Design a protein around this ligand. Structure first.
Ligand SMILES: C[C@H]1CCC[C@H](C[C@H]2Cc3cc(O)cc(O)c3C(=O)N2)C1
Ligand SMILES: C[C@H]1CCC[C@H](C[C@H]2Cc3cc(O)cc(O)c3C(=O)N2)C1
Ligand SMILES: N[C@@H](CCCC[NH3+])C(=O)O
Ligand SMILES: N[C@@H](CCCC[NH3+])C(=O)O
Lengths: 503, 504
């Protein structure tokens, strides 16, 4: 039946091309948008017409009805708002064609342009009253009904239908753009300078992830898509751009789930002469101010367990708690971790902690992977009422963070979590090139046991460190996850217009 | 020689560490920046000292001098600006360390923190007068001097050295960011909605270009890096986002030269219910307003032939000329190119023009590539002292542009050129799904002849069109080339922080 609908509508298009018409007119010159029309004529009175004011209006037909052969009613939508179309034979311009013939061909989904006047129906419904209605672009398929899209992957593979049908989706993506705008303005007002660094590099560094690989033909050179922006931005700090940032895509070649899309939008900034404490305060200020900006309050509700389940309240009122990674793992496990974290005493203790709690064993069982799994199991859901920081990660987990000024073995690192999900990662930057090559060599040793996601050594980066990187504080944001929490979405797929799908 | 210097300075660091001193302190709390200092104390009287005003300041030493063991002079730079440092034994805090011991070890390039007071030399030079100076981060290599970067690829391979040494580089990249901010605001003020579409797609469409390809391991799926943002943005128009745009990188897998970098920054916008004419007016409004915003005038100077030759003036006063591509090619070659343009007779005629003029023959010699080569050799430099549009391209060159409402075989398309280089490409959008499929079919015939840049059919896109794409006008800008002209650069490498280079 939809197949036959499509065939009949395609036949209509070809028949028009025969009869003479161009069924897709080039240009219709609109005088007012639908939101503007609503704003302007909202206050008309019941049944009042302004028959002398002729307006040119466009939009998409989303409902079709009739009352006899001389009254046609439509819903017309544009820019997320809707007016009524009231087509009365009494106002029809018969010089442009037979009334019935004009309106009988209009179908739900059709894009039209209307020459008419504003008014209210006898029931007070604000309407455009056409004197002529022109098909501008036909909808050749039947659109799904308001609720006939609910569980479908169609929302993600045919996002335009979702945007037409599900009123909330447009609101979600508006909020996403507002969040990004707020962030860009927040940084620009603080003296920060926005740049673009390469998406493709000889080495994909600045995080611990498996990269995408591609090939430039003319240079005959394999290139890696970036997993982070950290290394070139620090190079720009050496260059004297003392407050610098970048908002754009990065790429990680791993699994897809509700909180992972293979390309995702990050913001990283580098702030010369800042440190860990400045970054804690920046995070608290930014998040409290963003939430207040959007919602006029610091507390929001979030359906963590889905729309059909009870929601929780997340309080963004600062300050947020800070939990030190090592000693919280020590309390939770009831164990005490070792002096050198790589010690086979420590490694065995961590493996046996994972086994004593039936936690999945990482492979290879590197000290860093073990600490990470322990953290995700014993800490990352310590709070759901409030965001919170996991801090003071060991140097073993943090090859680019500066060593802690008073806690040997640890670094001045912070990660903010919302509802168990990481949205922020930041630290006092490691800037002694002699310790940095050290960390890179330890990472190469980890790669010598099967650690694929361990970052490769970047020689250009190390040379730049040798020219003097001032003490600096750097921070990264996960934009998509932030948007998920601020739009009440459970899946990253609901905040990305075209998420990566199984084909 | 540079190896010996780096050797000695690495040893200096190690020795500092042995002796307990940490040469990379964790945190120095600064009171004021160098530009803020310069603004704040600019009206200080010559010779005046504010000993009552202790400030913490940071920067990079860029010049070392002395008058001997009791006066040390330095240049200190930050955020592209510079002050003098006048370290006087008389003002040294001796309880924190020995004066000569502290200042003897400072080297050009070192990042320092200074506790001291502001003042002016008797000759009027704004200076910080240290009571204490702390090394924060040493420079272990000799920095090149003021004119040391002239013609090397050091500027492109170590951009940070370029940004430190050549003041003009920072100006260029500041202007780049200003141009993009201006564009974003220009569009947002007009109701436009910024979005992000995927960098990786099952089919790379939206332009005629060779793509990069990569693989997603977990899904075991080959993907193409996007060559344009056009197709998903039009899908968003179908979805009802009637003014939509994207600024970001796209990727093309072809040769590198002065106007081609394998990744470059484009802006594409889609404007429901607009057409070719609105897009011409938009282009004239945007370029004239951008230039006036940056320069306070509509006329700029551009060294088309490099710094050693006279520049030309480019006048961005609108309106700009419009040159119909087929008509201009016919006038220049004194030919008639009868339709259909991809007929065997017209292809042979075009090939014969190309051979008669010793122009290089496109491979394969499709009708569209022959048209493009004729235009490249014959008409794209018709104007140099002003931008201009080449308009009304044939359908066979323009598979996504709407058939021209009064000139059969052509489309409602415009490209803007500056000094022979394309910076803008726009048209009334093709919104008939049946015609769209026909166009993809033709492009595929060319693909089968060997055109690795012809567009491949995207059925998902054609399906979106079957739900009704309103009449729409779309436009793309090449941000990097625009920035080249507005910063007086001859190479795209001068407006990209880290341009793609052949490995060393
Ligand atoms: C810049 C950085 C700072 C805060 C933590 C984020 C992790 C990042 C991890 C990740 C992996 C992946 O394969 C796909 C994804 O979408 C994400 C994601 O959203 N966040 C981002
Ligand atoms: C969006 C579009 C609109 C106007 C024409 C520009 C062409 C585009 C062509 C190109 C190819 C390449 O492989 C490397 C490059 O840098 C460029 C470039 O800079 N501009 C961009
Ligand atoms: N590169 C980090 C974000 C910034 C960390 C601080 N320099 C990440 O991918 O998690
Ligand atoms: N996608 C085009 C720019 C937009 C043309 C108008 N839809 C290009 O890459 O040149």
């Amino acid at each position: 039946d939809p197949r036959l609908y499509f065939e009949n509508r395609s036949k209509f298009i070809q028949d028009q091309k025969d009869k003479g018409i161009n069924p897709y007119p080039h240009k219709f010159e609109r005088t007012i948008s639908i939101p503007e029309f609503i704003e302007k004529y909202k206050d008309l009175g019941n049944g009042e017409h302004l028959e002398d004011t002729i307006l040119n209006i466009t939009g998409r037909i989303m409902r079709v009805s009739a009352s006899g052969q001389k009254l046609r009613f439509f819903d017309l939508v544009g820019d997320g708002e809707k007016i009524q179309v009231l087509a009365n034979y009494s106002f029809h311009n018969h010089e442009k064609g037979n009334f019935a013939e004009c309106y009988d061909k209009i179908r739900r989904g059709d894009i039209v342009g209307i020459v008419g006047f504003p008014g209210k129906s006898k029931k007070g419904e604000l309407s455009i009253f056409p004197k002529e209605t022109i098909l501008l672009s036909a909808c050749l398929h039947m659109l799904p009904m308001k609720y006939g899209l609910k569980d479908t992957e169609i929302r993600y593979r045919q996002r335009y239908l979702d945007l037409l049908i599900n009123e909330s989706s447009r609101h979600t993506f508006v909020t996403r753009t507002k969040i990004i705008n707020f962030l860009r303005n927040f940084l620009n007002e603080r003296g920060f300078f926005e740049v673009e660094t390469p998406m493709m590099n000889l080495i994909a560094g600045g995080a611990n992830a498996r990269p995408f690989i591609t090939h430039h033909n003319d240079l005959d050179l394999d290139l890696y898509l970036r997993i982070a922006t950290e290394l070139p931005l620090k190079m720009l700090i050496v260059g004297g751009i003392d407050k610098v940032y970048e908002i754009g895509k990065v790429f990680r070649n791993e699994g897809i789930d509700n909180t992972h899309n293979p390309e995702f939008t990050s913001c990283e900034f580098y702030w010369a002469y800042a440190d860990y404490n400045d970054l804690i305060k920046w995070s608290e200020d930014f998040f409290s101010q963003l939430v207040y900006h959007l919602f006029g309050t610091y507390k929001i509700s979030y359906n963590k367990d889905g729309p059909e389940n009870q929601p929780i309240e997340i309080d963004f009122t600062p300050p947020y708690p800070k939990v030190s990674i090592v000693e919280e793992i020590e309390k939770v496990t009831n164990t005490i971790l070792e002096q050198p974290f790589d010690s086979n005493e420590t490694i065995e203790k961590m493996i046996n902690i994972i086994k004593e709690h039936k936690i999945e064993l990482p492979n290879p069982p590197t000290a860093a992977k073990l600490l990470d799994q322990l953290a995700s199991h014993f800490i990352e859901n310590k709070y759901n009422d409030k965001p919170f920081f996991i801090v003071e990660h060991p140097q073993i987990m943090s090859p680019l963070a500066k060593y802690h000024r008073t806690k040997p073995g640890l670094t001045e690192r912070l990660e903010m979590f919302i509802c168990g999900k990481e949205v922020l990662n930041a630290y006092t930057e490691l800037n002694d090139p002699f310790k940095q090559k050290e960390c890179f060599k330890l990472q190469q040793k980890d790669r010598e046991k099967g650690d694929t996601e361990a970052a490769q050594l970047d020689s250009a980066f190390c040379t730049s460190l040798e020219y003097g990187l001032p003490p600096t504080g750097g921070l990264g944001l996960g934009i998509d996850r932030i948007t998920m929490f601020l739009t009440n979405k459970n899946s990253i797929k609901d905040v990305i217009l075209f998420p990566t799908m199984r084909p």
